[PDB]
Every structure is written in C-alpha cells, then in structure tokens.
Symmetry: C3
C-alpha cells in the first residue's frame, strides 16, 4: 500500500487493502498515544487548511486536536473569514492553499467543489463531509466495530434512514471488508443510482449481499449493526412534514433491535435528534455512538499521517 | 492539596489552601517563564476545548496564548461553528468533548450549562465566566494584589457596582484569604441571597467582616482596594435609563478614593466604560487594571496545569 | 541593520538597506525550511495577536502557518469575537494585547488605528493591510521579482489600476531598490498627494524615474513588470458604474504586454476579478501571481523573526 500524496474524497477510489491500512494505522496511533502515552510529532512542521462551509463539532475537533497532537498546525477557515464565494475563484484559492498548507480538509456542499480543489491543488484534499459522501466517518465506524467484534468480515450492516452521504460511504466500502449491507430508505429517498450500481458490483466481487428495501424491519433482520442518522432534517423548512410523513416508521427502537442478530450494536454518526432513534437504543449498552465519535480523531490522524508522511505502523495488523 | 481532575466552576468549592495553591503555581509559572525565560511544555500533547457563547478579549487571549505557551493546543469554538443550541444536546457534546479534548473552558450564560457539562464530561470543565460567577478573574485579582502589597490577609476590598458575577466570586473567596469585604450595590441590584448567606458564613469562619450597603462611600471607607465593573450595561436596551438612574452616584472618582485607606489601589476586570469609573482613577498610578489583565494569563495557566498534570511549584510559597 | 522591537506599519519608515535585510531573511528562511527541510523553532514560546477586521485568505494563511511553522502560536481574532468597536477603547485593547502576545498583526480600515495600536502597545504592530498601505505585500512582490530576474536594480514597475494601498506601498519602496515606477490611474483616482510627494523625493535621492499618468499604455511602455489589483471593487454599491466607466480601458491584456519590455512579467496581490486583467495574461507563463502569493508566507516569517528575535541569516545576501 502506497497512499502518500493521495486525496481522500471518497472511499470508492480505495481498495479493501488500502482502507484496511488506514484502520491499522488508526489503531497503531491510538495504541501508541492513548495507551502508551507517547508523543509522536509525525506532522511536525506541517499545516492543514480546514475549510468549513457548514457547522461541525466532531469533524472540527477530531481534525484540529488530532493534527495538533502530531505536532502540526491546523488552521480553521470559514466562508465568513476567507475569500470563497463570489469572492475568489476556487482554482485560485486551491493554488494558494497549495503553497501555504500541506493538506486541506474541506467540509462542503458540492462534491464537485472537492473535485476542483483536488485537481487544482498539488497537496492532499480530504473530504470533511459533502452532500454525496462522508468517507472519514465510515473509517471511525469500521474501527469502532473491529474493536467491538475483534473482526469485520461477515458482519451485516443495517442502515435505516435517508439514502444520504453516510449510506453512500458504507456502500463504497462495506463489501471490500467482506460485510453485507441491508439498507432501508423511504420511497423517493433512495441512495444515488450511480452509487447503488457500484455497490452491487462490489458485493458481487466480494461475495457479499446487498439489499435495498423500504422496510426498516427488513433492513434490521439478522443485522449485527443497526445504523441511522438524522432524516427529518429539512433544517427548518415549513413545507417539510413529508420528510416526517415519508419517514414515519423509521425510528430505531428496541422493536428494531428485537429483529436484529443477538450480538447487535448501534451506530449514529451524530448529531442525533429524537426522531431517528429513541433514548433506549441510543443510550443502550449496545450503543457504540460515543466510542465511534472518539474514533473520528484516531482515524483522521491516520488519514493525515498516511497521506503526508512515510510512517509505517509498529502495531500488529488488526484482524479484519 | 490535590486538584488534578477537578472542575473549576466556582471558588465556593475551593478552600483557602486550594486557592492559595493556584496563586502559588501562577507565581511559579510567571517567575519561570516571564522572568527566567524558560520553556515549560507541561501541557504537551494536550488539547483544550474553548467554548465561547459571548465576546471575550482577556479570557480568550489569556487562555489561548497560555495553553499554547505550555505546549498544548487550544481550540476556539463558537455557537456559530459547532452544534450547540437546538443543534445537539449538551449531554452529547459534553461526552464528545471528553473523548477529544483534555479539558474545556466555557464562557456561557447559564451556570446550569457548566454544571451539566461538568456532570456529563469526564474531563475538567473550567468556567470562562457565567452570569453567576467568574472565579478565574478573582484568581488574577488576588495575585495582582499579593504582588502589590506583598501579602493579602487583613486587606479590605471595596466593591462598588452591580451585585454581579465578579462580586459573587469575591464573596466566595475573600474571607478564605482573611480579607474583609465592603460592597455597595443599588437597591434591587444586590448579590444573590444564596451567595450572600455563604459569604456571611465564610466571614464568620475566618474572622473577617462582610458589609453590604447601598452607599458607595460606605463601601469605600477604609478600603485598601477599590473594585468596580460595568453596571450601565443593559447592552443597548431602550427602556434601560433605570440602570443609569438606580446606579447614579456609583462612579468611582477621586472623591471615592479620598475615603479609602492611604495605600489604596484600584481594580476593574475589564472591558471598562466611562460610567463606572472616571479617567483619573482608571489611569491613576494606583490603578492595577492592566497588571490585573496580564495576570489572567498566568493564573489560567496555573489552573490548567493543576487540573491536568502533577507538576509541583519550584518557587517558594508567596506570603498571603 | 537593527529591526528588533520595531513596528512595521509602512515601508516609508524603512530604508533600502532595512527592506533588503527583510528580503535576505525571507530568502534564508525559505532556503532552510522549504529546500533543506529544516525545523527552525525561532519563535518558540511566542504568540501573535492577529486582528482581522476584513476578509483575508493570503494574509491570514501566510501569517498563521508561518508563525506556527517557527514554533509560535498565532491567535485569530475578529471583531465578532473580541471587544473592539464601541466595545472597548483601542488604547485598552492595545495594552491588554501587549501583556498577552508578543506582537500583533492587524488588518484594519483606518491606518490611524494601527498608529494608536503602535503608540499604545509596547509590542511590535505589523500592518496586515489598511486603506492606505499594504507593506508586507510589496515584500513578497519584490522577493518574487528578485527570484525571477536575479536582481532588482534598474527594473521598471508598471502599475495600472487604482491609486490604492498596493501602489502607495510600491511608491514607498521601489526607488530604495533603484527601481523605476510608471503608474496609470484614472482621473480622480490618483495616489495620495502626500505619498506621491514622498515618492518623488525617493526617486530623486535614488536617481530613479517616477511617472504618473492616466494612460495604461504609457505606464506599461518599457516596463519589466506589469502590476494591477481589483479596481471595480465598489464591493456591491448600486450607484458604482463610474468605477467601471472611469476605469474602462484599464484591463491588462496582451495589448498591454506588447508595449512592455521583452522580459516582462505580471503581478497581482490577489484576489483577482476578470475586470483588471484577462485570463491570457493572468495565467500566462509570464504571470508570477502564484509564486508571489506563496512568498507572502516566507516574507511574513522574516518580518516576525526580525522584529522579535536576534536571528542572523546564514544565507549569502541575495543580489538586489
């Protein structure tokens, strides 16, 4: 595996082996720093441009404390403070960022903006969430699952919710780890047809199952991991009611868990609202939500180290 | 004294000996770094979450440059950038902060928010000012006074102004250093009845006097330190006039100082407006305002070091 | 040359020799860090207050990554977050910044605010752009030109655009390097009469030519460097049309270059709009725009090191 200098816009560009390497490095960095208490200045004398177009708590903190914990300087940049709209062409900000920072993490709306940024910048561009994908979230999720189950292959993931960026990222990666996917979305709220097609292909290549359905309980049946995220989230758009009406019945409850495998667990990328999951499941001993949120930090540290240095993990490779 | 792992929401939870330790450590860090020019990476490999709900110049700068000066990474977080209102439950942001940062300094409105944050987070929560208390301000104030007078015991503090967070913090701490307090507030603008009751108790336990009055000159009589803060500060609320009418006569002038002890000095937490104090007192050689503002930095550094490390002061304990 | 402790509000206060020293140090820091890959913690245990009243991409990034790359902590401060308007007197924020940071870079509107800040603060105040000057931009520009041409003396600079802060900074410095200046501005959009008078004086003292004109092609004739910046920039003020009407004919095109010296190159401080220069010149192999933007970083690093440390350049002095 050779990842230095690459961008990380989506997991579709990464093989099973490459994503497994990032989880190995995550585990290595976590063992060395969190458990052995070592100081590892691997990104010393480096900087990161962190462009944020939307609010963030987890991606913000994990990237900022993580970049800094390796001795590098993270630079928090917003639309309000820098030139980015009608203020300056993205080609120009991409070249300017290239000569001043060593990499960019950018949370945008348009995935097309990440593509322009990656084409125009000569430094690594990491996706901090876009409307289409959220790869660095799935990195934390899969690490949290490997830590819980001691392996990944053969697990069935049960998505219940909107056919959004988190589901597309799972779709781009689950089969590469030999994990099955059963996903429930309302009619008209399906995953992107292009992504589904590629997920079907990955499932065939890896001998895993892919199931798309509109029934929450069908998605949950025999699943080891129940996964959801905010659906209602129309923000605050008066006419909404329909993201409530179409999504009625998608709340993850213990009824949902009753249908799942005996060793079931629960994930949610956060922030969480009451509509997608109730308090009984969200704060269940089986809920891996806050371990998951913590692993956003060790995995973005591993992303940064693999895309910018030639560091080799000292840890034994985790069983996947 | 054992302070590692504790929160610092208010000085009422701290004994005279514990607050004296923080001022000793402040003095130690200041002597070592400001005077001997040493580099002390005591908070290396640590991060701080700095949640700010209101504007700040002194708390912002002192905490940020101070955390960084000890080799740690401070992370400036606002309501605008992270999920914090109706955006995410505070219990969840508190647990997320716990796995990503080593401590949190939070400037909030509600003291109840600091309490939730302290109960839910497994990392130290430091008060960056709330409506009810501002403990880290009084730390700087008392250090500035010890440096001026070479001791603290027996000094009489003269508050003139609103019965606010600064006065409550003095009330929670002055008697523990064996200092007397005389405080003037307008009728209806008295300190919190709960705080006053506990201040009366501390005065009795330490053999000091507590005097509450509505007369500025009564508060100032025989006082070694004249202390005030912005009262008018209705922000900009049209109907106000009353915080001007009720507070008319509360401006600290040389008339006020004429009634004070011969060795009188003046404090103001800042920012300062013309209404609470005139330019003659504010820029008097007896005004300790800018030394006080500087000591916000050495004292928040000592707070952070005592709540996160096992560092022992090398300096001789200051005379209190 | 002795620059430690000085402010840098404008290049008019600096001799040819002093500005040459900053470009030597810039080149030294760039060779050592960018080319030899050295880590130089020259600003370790120092902090910078970066006050920004307006948007910034280049000044923000270059100052922040550059201060940090030398081991110091940059602190990004805005009008929204700190007390600065009617919130606190500038004299007081200047003294508070003096006891908490080691230097201040401030992007303001009024040059008078930088003057108050420099008079009241006991720490170095660096101009991050004001309405009247932008000295640290011209530092990068001249370094980029020295790198391109291998010297500076005798080059003719051709300004076409508004009589703004960039032109005033060139006016304050070009002749001190023995470079001629030909500047075109519309009628009524001339450089400040006070600045022009001092530029005329510098030209006489150094034996260089100064030409002010309203004709773009007259400014461009025989010029080695074509320089422009955003003129239209009325922001978004409806009545504008006149900054378009008065400035019609000021777009730098290959017609402009045809009249220039054979070895011509192009500069633009950025951000760039389509009106001041077309895409053919802006993205020409002769366009030094993005090297120029990169040199904002090495030059602000040299400013900071010369105003705060006693570091001597190890590099051979560049030929100017």
């Amino acid at each position: 595996v050779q990842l230095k200098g690459r961008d990380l816009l989506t997991l579709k560009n990464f093989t099973g082996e490459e994503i497994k390497y990032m989880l190995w490095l995550s585990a290595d960095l976590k063992f060395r720093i969190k458990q052995k208490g070592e100081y590892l200045p691997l990104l010393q004398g480096k900087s990161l441009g962190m462009i944020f177009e939307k609010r963030s708590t987890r991606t913000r903190l994990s990237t900022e404390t993580g970049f800094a914990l390796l001795g590098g300087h993270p630079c928090f940049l917003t639309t309000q403070d820098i030139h980015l709209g009608v203020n300056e062409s993205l080609t120009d900000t991409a070249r300017v960022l290239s000569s001043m920072a060593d990499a960019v993490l950018a949370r945008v709306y348009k995935q097309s903006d990440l593509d322009t940024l990656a084409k125009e910048a000569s430094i690594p561009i990491i996706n901090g969430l876009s409307d289409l994908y959220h790869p660095i979230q799935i990195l934390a999720d899969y690490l949290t699952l490997q830590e819980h189950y001691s392996s990944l292959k053969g697990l069935t993931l049960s998505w219940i919710g909107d056919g959004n960026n988190i589901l597309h990222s799972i779709m781009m990666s689950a089969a590469k780890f030999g994990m099955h996917l059963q996903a429930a979305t309302p009619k008209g709220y399906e995953p992107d047809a292009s992504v589904t097609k590629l997920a079907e292909q990955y499932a065939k290549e890896n001998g895993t199952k892919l199931l798309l359905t509109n029934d929450p309980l069908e998605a949950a049946h025999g699943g080891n991991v129940l996964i959801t995220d905010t659906w209602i989230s129309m923000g605050r758009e008066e006419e909404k009611k329909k993201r409530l009406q179409a999504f009625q019945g998608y709340q993850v409850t213990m009824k949902t868990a009753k249908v799942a495998a005996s060793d079931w667990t629960f994930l949610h990328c956060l922030p969480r609202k009451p509509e997608e999951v109730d308090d009984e499941v969200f704060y269940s001993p089986r809920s891996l939500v806050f371990p998951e949120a913590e692993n956003r930090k060790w995995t973005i540290m591993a992303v940064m180290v693999s895309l910018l240095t030639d560091y080799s993990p000292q840890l034994q490779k985790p069983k996947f």
